């Protein structure tokens, strides 16, 4: 009986092994930066 | 085979010696009244020469398979036809020793060993925790 149980655990090990095997543009940017840089320096100042 | 008969007082009314050891064999529960010795005794009422007398009679026999005085002797229960035995009793320390097998003593051994084997097996078997990825671990 004990051997049988151990065998069940072995089946569990196999299943786990299988599971683990399974588991293991440009203008838009230029315009956007143009704004960003402008607003960030606050150079306007007029 | 499991028991030990002693009539420590029986030594006191006599003293414990060879012919005495025979008679004391007769006193203990291990003795049988179905033997020839009882017949001879009863006939007498109504040690070599004894052995000489057993040669004439036909039946179960008990003879002297040792002398170590004043302690040990074997007393052999044998079935005479050529002499077949039966069992062998030892007399040591004013106590009748049961003649326990061969097979029975071995039985005792096996039994004991097996029993505690079982105990250990269960006790330890309760302990482990099993996870499929972890296998069997002891917490």
- How many angstroms separate the CA of residue A12 from the nearest CA in chain B? 5
What are the angstrom distances between the C-alpha of B74 and each of B47, B61, B107?
15, 14, 24
| Cβ within 8 Å of A, B 74-133 | 125, 130, 132-133
Residue contact A13–B135, C-beta within 8 A: yes
Contact B74, B89 (CB under 8 A): yes
- DSSP code of B102? S
CA distance A9 to A18: 14
Q: Is B66 exposed, middle or buried (0-12, 13-18, 19+ CB in 10 A)?
A: middle
**Test mutation, A1, A9, A10, A17, chain B, max B CBs within 10 A:** A9
Q: Which of B125, B133, B136 minimises the CB distance to A16?
A: B133
The candidate with the shortest Cα–Cα distance to A16, out of B86, B95, B131, is B131
Measured distance CA(B23)–CA(B116) in Å, rounded: 43
Question: Would you tell me how many other CB atoms lie within 10 Å of the CB of residue B92?
Answer: 13
Kindly determine whether residue A2 and residue B133, on different chains, have CB atoms separated by under 8 Å: no
Q: What are phi and psi of B28, to 5 degrees?
A: -70, 160
Find out whether B32 and B53 touch, Cβ atoms under 8 Å: no
- The angle that helices B36-45 and B18-27 make with each other, rounded to 10 degrees, is 100
Sequence-separated (6 or more) residues with CB below 8 Å from residue B54? B36, B61, B63, B80
Contact of A2 with chain B, judged by CB distance below 8 Å, is answered with yes
Length of chain B: 139
- The method of structure determination was cryo-EM
Closest-CA distance, B63 to chain A, in angstroms, reads 54
Report the relative pairing of strands B60-64 and B72-80 from DSSP bridges.
antiparallel
Count other C-beta atoms under 10 Å from residue B98's C-beta: 16
Chain B contact for A38 (CB, 8 A cutoff): no
Resolution limit in angstroms?
9.7
Alpha carbons within 13 A on the beta-carbon side of B38: 10
């Amino acid at each position: 009986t004990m051997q049988l149980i151990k065998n069940v655990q072995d089946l569990l090990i196999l299943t786990r092994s299988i599971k683990e095997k399974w588991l293991l543009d440009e203008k838009q940017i230029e315009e956007l930066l143009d704004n960003c840089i402008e607003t960030f320096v606050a150079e306007k100042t007029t | 085979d499991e028991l030990q008969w002693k009539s420590p007082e029986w030594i006191q009314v006599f003293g414990l010696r060879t012919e005495n050891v025979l008679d004391y064999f007769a006193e203990s529960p291990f003795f049988d009244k179905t033997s020839n010795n009882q017949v001879i005794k009863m006939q007498r009422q109504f040690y070599m020469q004894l052995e000489e007398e057993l040669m004439k009679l036909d039946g179960t026999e008990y003879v002297l398979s040792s002398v170590r005085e004043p302690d040990f002797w074997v007393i052999r229960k044998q079935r005479r036809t050529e002499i077949i035995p039966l069992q062998d009793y030892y007399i040591i320390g004013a106590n009748i020793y049961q003649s326990p097998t061969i097979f029975k003593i071995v039985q005792s051994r096996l039994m004991s060993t097996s029993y505690h084997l079982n105990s250990t097996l269960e006790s330890l078997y309760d302990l482990i925790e099993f996870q499929p990825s972890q296998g069997v671990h002891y917490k």
